[PDB]
Scaffold this active site. Structure first.
Site, PDB file in Angstrom:
ATOM      1  N   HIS A   1     -72.120  10.039  35.744  1.00 21.83           N
ATOM      2  CA  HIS A   1     -73.323   9.948  36.617  1.00 21.83           C
ATOM      3  C   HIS A   1     -73.542  11.230  37.429  1.00 21.83           C
ATOM      4  O   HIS A   1     -74.658  11.386  37.926  1.00 21.83           O
ATOM      5  CB  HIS A   1     -73.288   8.719  37.539  1.00 21.83           C
ATOM      6  CG  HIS A   1     -72.490   8.943  38.777  1.00 21.83           C
ATOM      7  ND1 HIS A   1     -71.124   8.831  38.791  1.00 21.83           N
ATOM      8  CD2 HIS A   1     -72.854   9.322  40.020  1.00 21.83           C
ATOM      9  CE1 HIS A   1     -70.679   9.103  40.002  1.00 21.83           C
ATOM     10  NE2 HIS A   1     -71.714   9.405  40.769  1.00 21.83           N
ATOM     11  N   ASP A   2     -72.538  12.100  37.577  1.00 23.82           N
ATOM     12  CA  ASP A   2     -72.682  13.378  38.332  1.00 23.82           C
ATOM     13  C   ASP A   2     -72.323  14.591  37.462  1.00 23.82           C
ATOM     14  O   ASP A   2     -71.974  15.644  38.041  1.00 23.82           O
ATOM     15  CB  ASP A   2     -71.829  13.341  39.600  1.00 23.82           C
ATOM     16  CG  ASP A   2     -72.525  12.741  40.812  1.00 23.82           C
ATOM     17  OD1 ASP A   2     -73.763  12.878  40.939  1.00 23.82           O
ATOM     18  OD2 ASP A   2     -71.813  12.155  41.625  1.00 23.82           O
TER      19      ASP A   2
ATOM     20  N   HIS B   1     -64.283  11.904  41.727  1.00 20.71           N
ATOM     21  CA  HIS B   1     -65.440  11.065  42.152  1.00 20.71           C
ATOM     22  C   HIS B   1     -65.924  10.221  40.964  1.00 20.71           C
ATOM     23  O   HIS B   1     -66.138   9.005  41.140  1.00 20.71           O
ATOM     24  CB  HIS B   1     -66.552  11.948  42.727  1.00 20.71           C
ATOM     25  CG  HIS B   1     -67.832  11.232  43.005  1.00 20.71           C
ATOM     26  ND1 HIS B   1     -67.943  10.269  43.986  1.00 20.71           N
ATOM     27  CD2 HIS B   1     -69.054  11.347  42.448  1.00 20.71           C
ATOM     28  CE1 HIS B   1     -69.182   9.825  44.026  1.00 20.71           C
ATOM     29  NE2 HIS B   1     -69.895  10.469  43.096  1.00 20.71           N
TER      30      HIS B   1
ATOM     31  N   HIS C   1     -68.285  16.178  44.510  1.00 22.04           N
ATOM     32  CA  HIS C   1     -68.988  15.733  43.276  1.00 22.04           C
ATOM     33  C   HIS C   1     -68.212  16.214  42.048  1.00 22.04           C
ATOM     34  O   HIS C   1     -68.778  16.934  41.215  1.00 22.04           O
ATOM     35  CB  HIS C   1     -70.444  16.192  43.300  1.00 22.04           C
ATOM     36  CG  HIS C   1     -71.286  15.396  44.235  1.00 22.04           C
ATOM     37  ND1 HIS C   1     -71.732  15.903  45.439  1.00 22.04           N
ATOM     38  CD2 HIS C   1     -71.763  14.137  44.150  1.00 22.04           C
ATOM     39  CE1 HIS C   1     -72.456  14.989  46.053  1.00 22.04           C
ATOM     40  NE2 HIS C   1     -72.486  13.895  45.286  1.00 22.04           N
TER      41      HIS C   1
ATOM     42  N   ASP D   1     -71.343   4.347  43.993  1.00 25.51           N
ATOM     43  CA  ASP D   1     -71.506   5.782  44.335  1.00 25.51           C
ATOM     44  C   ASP D   1     -71.029   6.019  45.775  1.00 25.51           C
ATOM     45  O   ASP D   1     -70.384   7.060  46.019  1.00 25.51           O
ATOM     46  CB  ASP D   1     -72.951   6.225  44.116  1.00 25.51           C
ATOM     47  CG  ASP D   1     -73.108   7.725  43.972  1.00 25.51           C
ATOM     48  OD1 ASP D   1     -72.087   8.397  43.749  1.00 25.51           O
ATOM     49  OD2 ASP D   1     -74.255   8.198  44.057  1.00 25.51           O
TER      50      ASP D   1
ATOM     51  N   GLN E   1     -71.801   9.454  61.086  1.00 27.17           N
ATOM     52  CA  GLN E   1     -71.217   8.376  60.250  1.00 27.17           C
ATOM     53  C   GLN E   1     -71.773   7.029  60.729  1.00 27.17           C
ATOM     54  O   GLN E   1     -72.235   6.237  59.892  1.00 27.17           O
ATOM     55  CB  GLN E   1     -69.693   8.455  60.296  1.00 27.17           C
ATOM     56  CG  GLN E   1     -69.144   9.657  59.543  1.00 27.17           C
ATOM     57  CD  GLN E   1     -69.386   9.539  58.056  1.00 27.17           C
ATOM     58  OE1 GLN E   1     -69.052   8.534  57.429  1.00 27.17           O
ATOM     59  NE2 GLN E   1     -69.993  10.566  57.486  1.00 27.17           N
TER      60      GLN E   1
HETATM   61  C1  LIG Z   1     -76.207  10.900  49.436  1.00 29.01           C
HETATM   62  C2  LIG Z   1     -75.134  11.909  49.768  1.00 29.01           C
HETATM   63  C3  LIG Z   1     -74.672  12.697  48.542  1.00 29.01           C
HETATM   64  C4  LIG Z   1     -73.189  12.819  48.650  1.00 29.01           C
HETATM   65  C5  LIG Z   1     -72.770  11.539  49.304  1.00 29.01           C
HETATM   66  N1  LIG Z   1     -73.887  11.246  50.214  1.00 29.01           N
HETATM   67  C6  LIG Z   1     -73.810  10.514  51.340  1.00 29.01           C
HETATM   68  O1  LIG Z   1     -74.758  10.410  52.114  1.00 29.01           O
HETATM   69  C7  LIG Z   1     -72.530   9.820  51.626  1.00 29.01           C
HETATM   70  C8  LIG Z   1     -71.752   9.059  50.744  1.00 29.01           C
HETATM   71  N2  LIG Z   1     -70.670   8.579  51.328  1.00 29.01           N
HETATM   72  N3  LIG Z   1     -70.737   9.008  52.617  1.00 29.01           N
HETATM   73  C9  LIG Z   1     -69.657   8.648  53.525  1.00 29.01           C
HETATM   74  C10 LIG Z   1     -71.831   9.777  52.839  1.00 29.01           C
HETATM   75  C11 LIG Z   1     -72.098  10.355  54.149  1.00 29.01           C
HETATM   76  O2  LIG Z   1     -71.173  10.764  54.853  1.00 29.01           O
HETATM   77  N4  LIG Z   1     -73.409  10.404  54.531  1.00 29.01           N
HETATM   78  C12 LIG Z   1     -73.929  10.922  55.730  1.00 29.01           C
HETATM   79  C13 LIG Z   1     -75.325  10.575  55.942  1.00 29.01           C
HETATM   80  C14 LIG Z   1     -75.944  11.018  57.047  1.00 29.01           C
HETATM   81  N5  LIG Z   1     -75.267  11.786  57.970  1.00 29.01           N
HETATM   82  C15 LIG Z   1     -75.682  12.352  59.152  1.00 29.01           C
HETATM   83  C16 LIG Z   1     -74.592  13.007  59.658  1.00 29.01           C
HETATM   84  C17 LIG Z   1     -74.497  13.867  60.848  1.00 29.01           C
HETATM   85  C18 LIG Z   1     -75.551  13.935  61.754  1.00 29.01           C
HETATM   86  C19 LIG Z   1     -75.497  14.801  62.832  1.00 29.01           C
HETATM   87  C20 LIG Z   1     -74.419  15.644  62.995  1.00 29.01           C
HETATM   88  C21 LIG Z   1     -73.386  15.616  62.086  1.00 29.01           C
HETATM   89  C22 LIG Z   1     -73.430  14.749  61.004  1.00 29.01           C
HETATM   90  N6  LIG Z   1     -73.509  12.889  58.799  1.00 29.01           N
HETATM   91  C23 LIG Z   1     -73.936  12.139  57.788  1.00 29.01           C
HETATM   92  C24 LIG Z   1     -73.261  11.692  56.640  1.00 29.01           C
HETATM   93 MG   LIG Z   2     -75.246  12.051  42.136  1.00 27.90          MG
HETATM   94 ZN   LIG Z   3     -71.985  10.329  42.711  1.00 29.01          ZN
END
Ligand SMILES: C[C@@H]1CCCN1C(=O)c1cnn(C)c1C(=O)Nc1ccn2cc(-c3ccccc3)nc2c1
Ligand SMILES: [Mg+2]
Ligand SMILES: [Zn+2]
Length: 314
Positions: A105-106, A71, A67, A216, A268
């Site tokens: 935005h962040d 970004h 963040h 985002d 993912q």
């Molecule tokens: C909303 C926030 C704030 C920062 C970005 N945000 C995102 O969500 C985001 C933005 N882009 N990407 C690429 C992601 C992302 O990787 N999300 C996620 C969402 C849910 N998961 C469950 C698991 C996971 C489950 C079990 C074991 C290990 C890992 N790993 C994830 C990654």
């Molecule tokens: Mg944000």
């Molecule tokens: Zn952001």
């Protein structure tokens, strides 16, 4: 006039949705000004005020893994690509507002979620009960705009200034992913019943909201090496928050537990199926020229599936 020019490769590739802004931090302000001049116009802002504004925004981003300032400019670039490929659909004030909203935005993000601030009992959680960090990001934007020599909107009437600040406020609040699920559902219903109306301000607000989510989340729309390396920075923050949850005596959710690292590929896959693919699907329905974001997202979904089958290493 003094027009901003980029090297030949950047000039060509910045028009692509999957452009990466590169590792030279000192080039990002010029890349931003270039995008503002082309998407808005060379007369939209006084260059001296815009430059002072950009450098104050940069200073109020923190040295966190994800963040961060990179970004902010990355999200702004995705918005630039959406605006340039749909240039007839947006107003003068929306073009002026939306690249600024993305840059800001962040602002002052510490790498912790709204949930962590609530559990910690952070003062911001008392001030802003919902969208805690996003209300903070907007408050930080207003503070910078009110610094001497930072009013980049000084040529607007009071009423026009109020309109662009409302576009910025709603756009920043929309980056609270908690609000995305409801917003996308409403837009899906509106599109499938054919009630969606871009002359309706409440409908425009929802479309801009989905555009902000799309911008985002745009790491999932890059070429695979960029997508994979960005995921490392995302998990660096998630796992640091998980550590802080454990220090409060709270079991973190799986994505925030560094001991669950081996399950990241399946995590993912879950995220692409539940959030990313639906987001870019709905956006392509409303703005067909954004198709390349959905295509790149589906390509990365296939890469994560390949990792899960042990044909790739992460
Ligand atoms: C909303 C926030 C704030 C920062 C970005 N945000 C995102 O969500 C985001 C933005 N882009 N990407 C690429 C992601 C992302 O990787 N999300 C996620 C969402 C849910 N998961 C469950 C698991 C996971 C489950 C079990 C074991 C290990 C890992 N790993 C994830 C990654
Ligand atoms: Mg944000
Ligand atoms: Zn952001």
């Amino acid at each position: 006039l003094m027009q901003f020019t980029l090297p030949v490769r950047l000039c060509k590739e910045i028009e692509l949705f999957h452009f990466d802004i590169g590792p030279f931090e000192n080039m990002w302000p010029g890349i931003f000004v270039y995008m503002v001049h082309r998407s808005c116009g060379t007369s939209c802002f006084e260059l001296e005020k815009l430059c002072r504004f950009i450098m104050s925004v940069k200073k109020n981003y923190r040295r966190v893994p994800y963040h961060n300032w990179k970004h902010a400019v990355t999200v702004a670039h995705c918005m630039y690509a959406i605006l340039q490929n749909n240039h007839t659909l947006f107003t003068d004030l929306e073009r002026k507002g939306l690249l600024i909203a993305c840059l800001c935005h962040d602002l002052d993000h510490r790498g912790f979620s709204n949930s962590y601030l609530q559990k910690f009992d952070h003062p911001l959680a008392a001030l802003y009960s919902t969208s805690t960090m996003e209300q903070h990001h907007f408050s930080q934007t207003v503070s910078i705009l009110q610094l001497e020599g930072h009013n980049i909107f000084s040529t607007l009437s009071s009423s026009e200034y109020e309109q662009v600040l409302e576009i910025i406020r709603k756009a920043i609040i929309a980056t609270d992913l908690a609000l995305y699920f409801g917003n996308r559902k409403q837009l899906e219903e509106m599109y499938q019943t054919g009630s969606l109306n871009l002359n309706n301000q409440s409908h425009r607000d929802r479309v801009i909201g989905l555009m902000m989510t799309a911008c985002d989340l745009c790491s999932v729309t890059k070429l695979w090496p960029v997508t994979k390396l960005t995921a490392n920075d995302i998990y660096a923050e998630f796992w640091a928050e998980g550590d802080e949850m454990k220090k409060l005596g709270i079991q973190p959710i799986p994505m925030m537990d560094r001991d669950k690292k081996d399950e990241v590929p399946q995590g993912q896959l879950g995220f692409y199926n539940a959030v990313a693919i639906p987001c870019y699907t709905t956006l392509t329905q409303i703005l067909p020229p954004t198709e390349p974001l959905l295509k790149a997202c589906r390509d990365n979904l296939s890469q994560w599936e390949k990792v899960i089958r042990g044909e790739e290493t992460a």
